[PDB]
Amino acid sequence: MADVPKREVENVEFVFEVMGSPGEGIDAVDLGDALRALNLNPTLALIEKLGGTKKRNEKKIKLDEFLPIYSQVKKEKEQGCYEDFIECLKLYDKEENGTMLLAELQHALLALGESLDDEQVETLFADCMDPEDDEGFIPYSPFLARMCDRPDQL
Amino acid sequence: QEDEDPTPYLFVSLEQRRIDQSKPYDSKKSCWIPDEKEGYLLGEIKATKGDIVSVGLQGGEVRDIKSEKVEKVNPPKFEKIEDMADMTVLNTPCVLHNLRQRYYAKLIYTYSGLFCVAINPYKRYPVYTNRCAKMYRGKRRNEVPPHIFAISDGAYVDMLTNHVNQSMLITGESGAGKTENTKKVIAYFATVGASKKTDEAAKSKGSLEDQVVQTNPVLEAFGNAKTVRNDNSSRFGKFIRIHFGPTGKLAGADIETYLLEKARVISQQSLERSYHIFYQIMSGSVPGVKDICLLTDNIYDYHIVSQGKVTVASIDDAEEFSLTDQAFDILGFTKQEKEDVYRITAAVMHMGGMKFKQRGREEQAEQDGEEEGGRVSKLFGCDTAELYKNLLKPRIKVGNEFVTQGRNVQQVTNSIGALCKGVFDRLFKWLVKKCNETLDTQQKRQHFIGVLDIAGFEIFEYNGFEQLCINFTNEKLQQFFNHHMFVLEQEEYKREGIDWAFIDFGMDLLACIDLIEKPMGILSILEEESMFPKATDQTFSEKLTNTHLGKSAPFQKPKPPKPGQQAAHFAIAHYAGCVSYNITGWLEKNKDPLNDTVVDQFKKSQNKLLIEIFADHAGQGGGFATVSSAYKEQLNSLMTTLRSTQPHFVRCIIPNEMKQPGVVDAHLVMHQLTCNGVLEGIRICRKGFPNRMMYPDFKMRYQILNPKGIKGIEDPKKCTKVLIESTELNDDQYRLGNTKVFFRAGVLGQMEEFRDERLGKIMSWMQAWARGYLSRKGFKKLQEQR
The single-letter DSSP state of residue B144 is S
CB atoms within 10 A of CB B244: 25
Half-sphere exposure (Cβ direction) of A137: Cα atoms closer than 13 Å: 13
* CB-based contact B260:B428 (threshold 8 Å): yes
Half-sphere exposure (Cβ direction) of B433: Cα atoms closer than 13 Å: 9
Distance CA(B254)–CA(B243), nearest Å, equals 8
Q: Label residues B563-602 b or e (16+ Cβ within 10 Å = b).
A: eeeeebbbbbbbbbeebbbbbbebbebbbbbebbbbbbbb
E strand or H helix at A61, and its extent?
strand A60-61
Distance CA(B664)–CA(B102), nearest Å, equals 11
Question: Quick check: helix, strand or coil at residue A136?
Answer: coil
The single-letter DSSP state of residue B258 is E
Q: For residue B740, what are the β-bridge partners?
A: B694
Range of the domain at A8: 1-82
The single-letter DSSP state of residue B730 is -
* Best residue in A12, A41, A123 for a mutation probing chain B (most B CBs within 10 Å): A41
Q: Count how many residues are written for chain B.
A: 786
3-state secondary structure B553-602: CCEECCCCCCCCCCCCCEEEEECCEEEEECCCCHHHHHECCCCHHHHHHH
The resolution of the experimental structure, rounded to one decimal in Å, is 2.2
Close Cβ partners of A134 (under 8 Å, ≥ 6 residues apart): none
Distance CA(B583)–CA(B534), nearest Å, equals 17
Bind-site residues of B for ATP: 172-179
Distance CA(B362)–CA(B384), nearest Å, equals 23
Distance of alpha carbon B654 from its chain centroid, rounded? 13
Give which of B467, B469, B455, B456 is closest to B582, Cα–Cα.
Answer: B467
Kindly give the pairing relationship between strand B39-49 and strand B166-171.
Answer: unpaired
* CB-based contact B540:B548 (threshold 8 Å): no
Q: Is A122 on the interface with B (CB under 8 A)?
A: no
Residue A104 and residue A33 in one domain: no
Which CATH fold topology does B691-785 show? Methane Monooxygenase Hydroxylase; Chain G, domain 1 (1.20.58)
* CB-based contact B480:B452 (threshold 8 Å): no
Across the interface, whether the CB atoms of A43 and B765 are under 8 A apart is answered: yes
Across the interface, whether the CB atoms of B767 and A149 are under 8 A apart is answered: no
Close Cβ partners of B680 (under 8 Å, ≥ 6 residues apart): B478, B481, B482, B575, B576, B674
Distance CA(B169)–CA(B259), nearest Å, equals 16
**Cα-Cα-Cα-Cα dihedral sign, residues B289, B291, B294, B295:** positive
Give which of B51, B58, B53 is closest to B37, Cα–Cα.
Answer: B58
The single-letter DSSP state of residue B108 is -
Residue A103 and residue A66 in one domain: no
- Cβ contacts of B775 on chain A, cutoff 8 Å: 32-33, 36-37
Q: Note if B67 is an active site residue.
A: no
Close Cβ partners of B323 (under 8 Å, ≥ 6 residues apart): B217
Q: How many domains are there within chain A?
A: 2
* Domain boundary residue, one of A63, A82, A101: A82
**Cα-Cα-Cα-Cα dihedral sign, residues B370, B376, B378, B380:** negative
Residue B18 has its nearest CB partner, among A40, A90, A107, at A107
Distance CA(B425)–CA(B222), nearest Å, equals 9
Residue A48 and residue A117 in one domain: no
Distance CA(B47)–CA(B16), nearest Å, equals 33
Q: Is A3 on the interface with B (CB under 8 A)?
A: no
Q: For residue A121, what is the domain's CATH number?
A: 1.10.238.10
* CB-based contact A15:A69 (threshold 8 Å): no
- Cβ contacts of A37 on chain B, cutoff 8 Å: 775-776, 779
Residue A88 and residue A116 in one domain: yes
How distant, in Å, are the alpha carbons of A80, A140, B586 from that of A3? 25, 39, 97
Closest CA–CA distance from residue A141 to any residue of chain B (Å): 13
- Cβ contacts of B704 on chain A, cutoff 8 Å: 87-88, 90-91
Residue A69 and residue A18 in one domain: yes
Question: Quick check: helix, strand or coil at residue B400?
Answer: coil
Q: Note if B175 is an active site residue.
A: yes
Whether A139 is in a domain gets the answer: yes
- Cβ contacts of B766 on chain A, cutoff 8 Å: 80, 85, 88, 109, 113
Whether A153 is in a domain gets the answer: no
Residue B700 has its nearest CB partner, among A19, A94, A149, at A94
Q: What angle do CA B132, B134, B139 make, to 5 degrees?
A: 110
- Cβ contacts of A106 on chain B, cutoff 8 Å: none
Q: Is A124 on the interface with B (CB under 8 A)?
A: yes
* Domain boundary residue, one of A34, A60, A82: A82
Whether A154 is in a domain gets the answer: no
* CB-based contact B605:B379 (threshold 8 Å): no
Phi, psi of B236 (to 5 degrees): -150, 150
Across the interface, whether the CB atoms of B775 and A91 are under 8 A apart is answered: no
Burial class (CB in 10 A: 0-12, 13-18, 19+), A58: exposed
Residue A128 and residue A59 in one domain: no
Q: Looking at chain A, which residue has its C-alpha nearest residue B17?
A: A104
Whether A49 is in a domain gets the answer: yes
Q: Is A21 on the interface with B (CB under 8 A)?
A: no
Residue A53 and residue A90 in one domain: no
Rg of chain A over CA atoms, in angstroms? 18
E strand or H helix at B351, and its extent?
helix B335-352
How distant, in Å, are the alpha carbons of B559, B576, B581 from that of B570? 8, 16, 6
User: Which technique was used to obtain these atomic coordinates?
Assistant: X-ray
* Domain boundary residue, one of A58, A82, A106: A82
Q: Name residue B187's amino acid.
A: A
Q: Label residues B635-653 b or e (16+ Cβ within 10 Å = b).
A: beebeebbeebbbbbbbbb
Distance CA(B515)–CA(B553), nearest Å, equals 9
Residue A89 and residue A47 in one domain: no
Distance CA(B716)–CA(B703), nearest Å, equals 10
* CB-based contact B105:B125 (threshold 8 Å): no
